[PDB]
Amino acid sequence: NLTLNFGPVLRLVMELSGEMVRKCDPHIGLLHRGTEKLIEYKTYLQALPYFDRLDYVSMMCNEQAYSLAVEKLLNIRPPPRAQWIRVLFGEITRLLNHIMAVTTHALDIGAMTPFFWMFEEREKMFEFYERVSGARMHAAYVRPGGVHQDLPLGLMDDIYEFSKNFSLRIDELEEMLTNNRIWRNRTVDIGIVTAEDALNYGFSGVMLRGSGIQWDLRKTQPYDVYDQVEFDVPIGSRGDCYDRYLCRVEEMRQSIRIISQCLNKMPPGEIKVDDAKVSPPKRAEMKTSMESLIHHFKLYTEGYQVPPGATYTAIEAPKGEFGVYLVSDGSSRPYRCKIKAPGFAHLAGLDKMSKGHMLADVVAIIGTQDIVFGEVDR
Amino acid sequence: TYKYVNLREPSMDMKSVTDRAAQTLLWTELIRGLGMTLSYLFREPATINYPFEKGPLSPRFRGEHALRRYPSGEERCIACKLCEAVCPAQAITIEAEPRADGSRRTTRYDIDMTKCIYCGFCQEACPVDAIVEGPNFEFSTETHEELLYNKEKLLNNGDKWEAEIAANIQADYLYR
Amino acid sequence: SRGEYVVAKLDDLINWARRSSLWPMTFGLACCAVEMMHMAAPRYDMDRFGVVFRASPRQSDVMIVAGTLTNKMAPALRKVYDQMPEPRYVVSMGSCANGGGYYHYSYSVVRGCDRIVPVDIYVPGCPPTAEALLYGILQLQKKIKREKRLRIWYRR
Amino acid sequence: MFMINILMLIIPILLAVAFLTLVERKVLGYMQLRKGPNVVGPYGLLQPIADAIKLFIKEPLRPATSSASMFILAPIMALGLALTMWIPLPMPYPLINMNLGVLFMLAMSSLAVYSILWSGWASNSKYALIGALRAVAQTISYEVTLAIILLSVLLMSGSFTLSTLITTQEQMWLILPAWPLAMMWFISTLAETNRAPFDLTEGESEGFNVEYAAGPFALFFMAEYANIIMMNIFTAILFLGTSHNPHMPELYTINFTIKSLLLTMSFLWIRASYPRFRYDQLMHLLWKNFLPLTLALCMWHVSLPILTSGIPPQT
Amino acid sequence: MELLQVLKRGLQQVSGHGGLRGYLRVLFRANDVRVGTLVGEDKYGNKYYEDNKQFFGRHRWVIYTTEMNGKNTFWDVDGSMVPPEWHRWLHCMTDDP
Amino acid sequence: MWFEVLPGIAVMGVCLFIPGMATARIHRFSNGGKEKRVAHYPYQWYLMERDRRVSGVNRSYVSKGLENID
Amino acid sequence: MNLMLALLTNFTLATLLVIIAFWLPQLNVYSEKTSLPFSMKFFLVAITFLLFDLEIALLLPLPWASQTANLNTMLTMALFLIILLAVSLAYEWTQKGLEWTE
Numbered sequence A: 001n002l003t004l005n006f007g008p009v010l011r012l013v014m015e016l017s018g019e020m021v022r023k024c025d026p027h028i029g030l031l032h033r034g035t036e037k038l039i040e041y042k043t044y045l046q047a048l049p050y051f052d053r054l055d056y057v058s059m060m061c062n063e064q065a066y067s068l069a070v071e072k073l074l075n076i077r078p079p080p081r082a083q084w085i086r087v088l089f090g091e092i093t094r095l096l097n098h099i100m101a102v103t104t105h106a107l108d109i110g111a112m113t114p115f116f117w118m119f120e121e122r123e124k125m126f127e128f129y130e131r132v133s134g135a136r137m138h139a140a141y142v143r144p145g146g147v148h149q150d151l152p153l154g155l156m157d158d159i160y161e162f163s164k165n166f167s168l169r170i171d172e173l174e175e176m177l178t179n180n181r182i183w184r185n186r187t188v189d190i191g192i193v194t195a196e197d198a199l200n201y202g203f204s205g206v207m208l209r210g211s212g213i214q215w216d217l218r219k220t221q222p223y224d225v226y227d228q229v230e231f232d233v234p235i236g237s238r239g240d241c242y243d244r245y246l247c248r249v250e251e252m253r254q255s256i257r258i259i260s261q262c263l264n265k266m267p268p269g270e271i272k273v274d275d276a277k278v279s280p281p282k283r284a285e286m287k288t289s290m291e292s293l294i295h296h297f298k299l300y301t302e303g304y305q306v307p308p309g310a311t312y313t314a315i316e317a318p319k320g321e322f323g324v325y326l327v328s329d330g331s332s333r334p335y336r337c338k339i340k341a342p343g344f345a346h347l348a349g350l351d352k353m354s355k356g357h358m359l360a361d362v363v364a365i366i367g368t369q370d371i372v373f374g375e376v377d378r
Numbered sequence B: 001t002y003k004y005v006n007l008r009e010p011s012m013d014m015k016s017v018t019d020r021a022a023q024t025l026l027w028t029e030l031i032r033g034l035g036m037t038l039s040y041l042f043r044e045p046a047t048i049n050y051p052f053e054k055g056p057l058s059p060r061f062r063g064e065h066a067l068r069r070y071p072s073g074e075e076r077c078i079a080c081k082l083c084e085a086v087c088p089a090q091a092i093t094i095e096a097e098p099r100a101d102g103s104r105r106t107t108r109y110d111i112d113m114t115k116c117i118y119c120g121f122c123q124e125a126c127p128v129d130a131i132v133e134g135p136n137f138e139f140s141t142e143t144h145e146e147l148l149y150n151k152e153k154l155l156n157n158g159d160k161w162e163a164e165i166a167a168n169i170q171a172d173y174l175y176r
Numbered sequence C: 001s002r003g004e005y006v007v008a009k010l011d012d013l014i015n016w017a018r019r020s021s022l023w024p025m026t027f028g029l030a031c032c033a034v035e036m037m038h039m040a041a042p043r044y045d046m047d048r049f050g051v052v053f054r055a056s057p058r059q060s061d062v063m064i065v066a067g068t069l070t071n072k073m074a075p076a077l078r079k080v081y082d083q084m085p086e087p088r089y090v091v092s093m094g095s096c097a098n099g100g101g102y103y104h105y106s107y108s109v110v111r112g113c114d115r116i117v118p119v120d121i122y123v124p125g126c127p128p129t130a131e132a133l134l135y136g137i138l139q140l141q142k143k144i145k146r147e148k149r150l151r152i153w154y155r156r
Numbered sequence D: 001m002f003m004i005n006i007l008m009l010i011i012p013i014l015l016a017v018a019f020l021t022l023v024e025r026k027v028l029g030y031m032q033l034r035k036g037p038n039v040v041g042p043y044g045l046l047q048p049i050a051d052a053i054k055l056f057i058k059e060p061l062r063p064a065t066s067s068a069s070m071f072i073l074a075p076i077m078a079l080g081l082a083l084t085m086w087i088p089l090p091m092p093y094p095l096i097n098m099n100l101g102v103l104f105m106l107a108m109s110s111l112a113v114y115s116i117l118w119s120g121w122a123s124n125s126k127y128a129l130i131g132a133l134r135a136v137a138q139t140i141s142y143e144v145t146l147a148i149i150l151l152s153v154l155l156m157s158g159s160f161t162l163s164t165l166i167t168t169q170e171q172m173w174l175i176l177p178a179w180p181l182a183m184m185w186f187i188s189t190l191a192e193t194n195r196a197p198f199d200l201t202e203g204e205s206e207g208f209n210v211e212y213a214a215g216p217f218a219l220f221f222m223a224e225y226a227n228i229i230m231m232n233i234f235t236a237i238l239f240l241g242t243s244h245n246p247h248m249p250e251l252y253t254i255n256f257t258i259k260s261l262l263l264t265m266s267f268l269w270i271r272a273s274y275p276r277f278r279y280d281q282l283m284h285l286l287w288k289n290f291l292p293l294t295l296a297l298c299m300w301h302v303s304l305p306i307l308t309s310g311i312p313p314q315t
Numbered sequence E: 001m002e003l004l005q006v007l008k009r010g011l012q013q014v015s016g017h018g019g020l021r022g023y024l025r026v027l028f029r030a031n032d033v034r035v036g037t038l039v040g041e042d043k044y045g046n047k048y049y050e051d052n053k054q055f056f057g058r059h060r061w062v063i064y065t066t067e068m069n070g071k072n073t074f075w076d077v078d079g080s081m082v083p084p085e086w087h088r089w090l091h092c093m094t095d096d097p
Numbered sequence F: 001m002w003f004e005v006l007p008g009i010a011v012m013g014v015c016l017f018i019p020g021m022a023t024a025r026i027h028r029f030s031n032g033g034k035e036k037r038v039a040h041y042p043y044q045w046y047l048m049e050r051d052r053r054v055s056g057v058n059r060s061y062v063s064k065g066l067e068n069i070d
Numbered sequence G: 001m002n003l004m005l006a007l008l009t010n011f012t013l014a015t016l017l018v019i020i021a022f023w024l025p026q027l028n029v030y031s032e033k034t035s036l037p038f039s040m041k042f043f044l045v046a047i048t049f050l051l052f053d054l055e056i057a058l059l060l061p062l063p064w065a066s067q068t069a070n071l072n073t074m075l076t077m078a079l080f081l082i083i084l085l086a087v088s089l090a091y092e093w094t095q096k097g098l099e100w101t102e
């Protein structure tokens, strides 16, 4: 057969028989940076920014996974307002990831116009990030114990104004793709996964719901305040790229539904756990109280000690089940931090999903898995 | 709760089959796509006229690191190394000694701006608001060595941007 | 007039053309590529300066190294640079490409892309905002405007 | 006076091509919520000049080619034939008034497929040659519908002369009686010219000119963009005929030009709206959708004049 | 009619910039010929304008000075030429110039 | 705004207008103010050659009326 | 004579642009660089186009053929040729000849 080394950050070594794909062998590691080994040399607060940079399209959903794991070991609970902010920006982040997933997928197979319409919406959502953290992408805003700062006055009104119009933006995306026969030809019956294969290959997220499996960690194993919001889980029926595209577009509509409830049900209170041995005190009291300055000093040099133990904490990140197996030895630095990137199991199944398809279908299959190589390689 | 995205049966009554035949032969749904992009042609573009117009920012924006002073001109930094100990990228290098008048001040304060991840942890950890991230985001250089700031560059930034750093801190110090 | 004056106007014309048609080849390796995509998005619309969104490497005039350059990827990046027709410029975007950034002390990260290829503009940030990258492209255009290729040739 | 006439044809074609790149980049920009080139010159009018100068002073890219003579022949053939397809066009008076003008344009466009084929050979890249074979297969496939569709429209005109299409449409555009053919003719010109949604040669992650960069690449680009205008001018003469007043020829040219620009703009309009076909899917469009309908409509358009007593004149 | 008063705005931009020379200067220096309210001028010669009927992002802009610190900036303008006091107002970190 | 696309379209239109305007005016300049004679079939060519001989000058676009008849 | 002079100009102009485009770049004097398996489906599409092309050659003279007094004979032969061209397409279609899956 013909062997093609589609070099670059992905290197596909395919074995083509005519126009069909007989074997796809992804070569990864072109973005492997040793994140897991670096985390062992950092305190728990110092390792938080490393998680913005794994799935760098869903930055504030990666922080939440790490924060839930450290909080579980710490045996603390973030305050209720901090949990609504974490569920509000979890869904804003899911809109960010699903815009990048659908439109980049569309741009790969030719449709270049929806990318520019929706990346203006991403630009406005990057402003919400920058008004709570000061950074457009790598906020480092969700932390063990809550969030760094409180929402500035006027943000929630600006989130409301953005959310009113966003359904119309999705409807314009659907006027270009959903019924367009050319798009349906590129996605329908492409990359079919049986529900039993999807479970055994470690798939998660819409890679399961696209095959009809009724599973969503936000509803089966809820975290923060997802048990207090009402939304629907879109389920596919054919297991193909088209159904996975409709699940993602429908999840954006449900994210707007959740954002509508977070804005109304946002409670008052503080935004980080009122325990100064875990969360630093306010600067006003760090400059007046002896205890506060001691605890500020030691939380920013040594860090908080975490009891010995090991947790596997997972969330329903936009890409899929994102989790961390975090091992504490009692000190202020993690002993082990294994990162479970959902795309790692998905991309491992590209070979199976590409059997019996043409070379141009491999581009559509990689798009439907929603692969970002920050998390695949870590 | 859940919903089905693609679990509908197309009608087989003659009218519906002919409605689908018209769509296939007369390209009706491909012509809605043309209508949706003709709409955008007559919408005003979202482009701004950079560099004469700038993208909006907030007082929390994290930009170029800078070293500040008290209203008397005395440096705020008292060489405590909390910023150095918390920098995730290990980008701060500090050395200190007793100044000529007995004060506790740095003889070295370097930031490798190519190691820095612009995270703002240093300005969180400083008890005297000495090191901050100013609002500047236009300091691209032509050589790698211009991004290795020493204490003079950082003090120059503070004198250069104090008028704007002070007003950004005044607008946001009550949230921190 | 003097020969320098005549050959200085031709220098301006070719300098003007080259900075008005900067076609970039973006090595999108990590998160800094998202901000590169935001510079092409409507708000900044890099295509209005003449900077096409994405050109093929053999048609490209500038290479934007936007992300972490790992040892495994280093030889690939050099090969693309060696195949760029001249004149060719490199823009280092973000801390990872500048000096390794957050992963400077890693066993599998090149400590700055300027160990593999020569760099013309360094753009600081993690990531630089789309406006900061645009400010760096407009600085590369100003750097092309100051070239004196024909003056050096004339005075040789 | 004839040599002046040729230059009054060649030069404006290349300037029309030059500023079609600008118009394409702005039109896509405004459909994409952008602005497009608006810095280099006022409203971007100097952007085409900047690109031209830049390309023609960039370092040559030519690697080792096995048929260097074939490397130079492909751009010459592509650009020589692209200009040669303009000489019979009535606008309203043709440069070369041919009795068989329609056949002449089919013949010349069936030779431009050699430029694709020769460039694939002269690239010394087994993966560039595969790309050229796909590009050739698509082009010749859609030449079948162009000839049969064109033959069906001439059975109402009565001759292969391009100027007789003006007379045939003096009462009514041929699109009204032949809109089914116009629909397929129009899409064939897209596939023939390798434009979106049929530009699988630009499947970056999914061209044969890669071995050309700057210089010769600029010439292939001009040939391709010159054919888009020519095809859309051919479409206007064939299905949107303009009234010709012998005493005011310039009235024809204004109306004829406006039609040919709108059709050219619609090519940009289409490129901004759709994803692209797989290679097999654009073949199945031709062999299993267009060809069955084109053959059926050729039978109908041979018999229709006979059964209505509407056979056109031979002269 | 709205069609006519669109052309009124087009002409009033020529006069709003001080004539044809001023209209051309702003067209070629800044690629924009909009007219806004003058908010202030800094000690380096940069003029700052405002138009709150424009959408957020284009409602504030600076026309850079033609000479700053002994450098000819007629064609060479830089985003870093904005002094810190106006930098805050130009990037919408505040509402008060 | 969308009307900023028009200046580029205007240049294309003028460039595409020249070929058809130039041909019309050059034909009338070269053929005594008349359209260029169309001869697609050999009968039309025979008459054009007959006009060239009748012209007195060797040009077929010079017509002779009822003034060469006695 | 006009057509001969028209073709000469177009290819001479194209030839001049090609050579200068190859040589005009070669004055910057840049630094020295110092640096298929046969598919039977591509052949079948090329052959099928040829046989359809030869049928199109026989159909091209139809505009002239409709000016004859034997219209009953001409229309029969014209429809016979087009129909036989459809039969070829039907035959290749049913024999999996138009497919691209291996």
Ligand SMILES: CCCCCCCCCCCCCCCCCC(=O)OC[C@H](COP(=O)([O-])OCC[N+](C)(C)C)OC(=O)CCCCCCCCCCCCCCCCC
Pocket (backbone or CB within 6 Å): A181, B024, B025, B026, B027, B030, B031, D180, D182, D183, D184, D186, D187, D197, D235, D239, D270, D274, D285, D289, D290, D293, D300
């Ligand atoms: C008494 C009357 C007797 C004579 C009547 C003769 C006519 C009768 C009516 C015939 C039906 C009309 C035929 C139309 C052509 C159908 C072609 C076809 O096969 O379509 C299905 C084809 C294929 O449809 P499909 O992909 O969904 O699949 C069909 C077959 N199955 C389902 C089995 C797989 O669709 C297309 O052709 C779309 C091609 C892509 C188009 C992208 C560009 C769109 C641009 C839109 C603008 C076009 C404007 C055109 C105007 C130009 C003006 C100059």
Ligand SMILES: CCCCCCCCCCCC(=O)OC[C@H](COP(=O)(O)OCC[N+](C)(C)C)OC(=O)CCCCCCCCCCC
Pocket (backbone or CB within 6 Å): C009, C010, C012, C013, C016, C145, C146, E075, E076
């Ligand atoms: C006779 C030899 C042929 C070349 C003729 C000169 C063309 C090159 C100059 C334009 C680029 C330029 O100069 O850039 C833009 C300039 C301003 O440049 P600046 O910032 O003042 O330059 C600073 C000094 N530098 C450049 C060394 C760093 O805008 C102008 O006012 C130019 C607009 C008028 C251009 C008219 C062109 C007419 C020639 C057409 C046929 C070639």
Ligand code: SF4
Pocket (backbone or CB within 6 Å): B065, B086, B087, B088, B089, B090, B091, B092, B111, B115, B116, B117, B118, B119, B120, B121, B122, B123, B133
């Ligand atoms: S912003 Fe972050 S990376 Fe930069 S110096 Fe401060 S702590 Fe270090």
Ligand code: SF4
Pocket (backbone or CB within 6 Å): B076, B077, B078, B079, B080, B081, B082, B083, B084, B094, B125, B126, B127, B128, B129, B130, B131
């Ligand atoms: S900048 Fe602040 S935290 Fe760092 S050494 Fe000085 S006083 Fe301590």
Ligand code: SF4
Pocket (backbone or CB within 6 Å): A053, C030, C031, C032, C066, C067, C068, C093, C094, C095, C096, C097, C101, C102, C125, C126, C127, C128
């Ligand atoms: S510099 Fe920052 S944003 Fe850019 S690739 Fe590295 S970690 Fe990501």
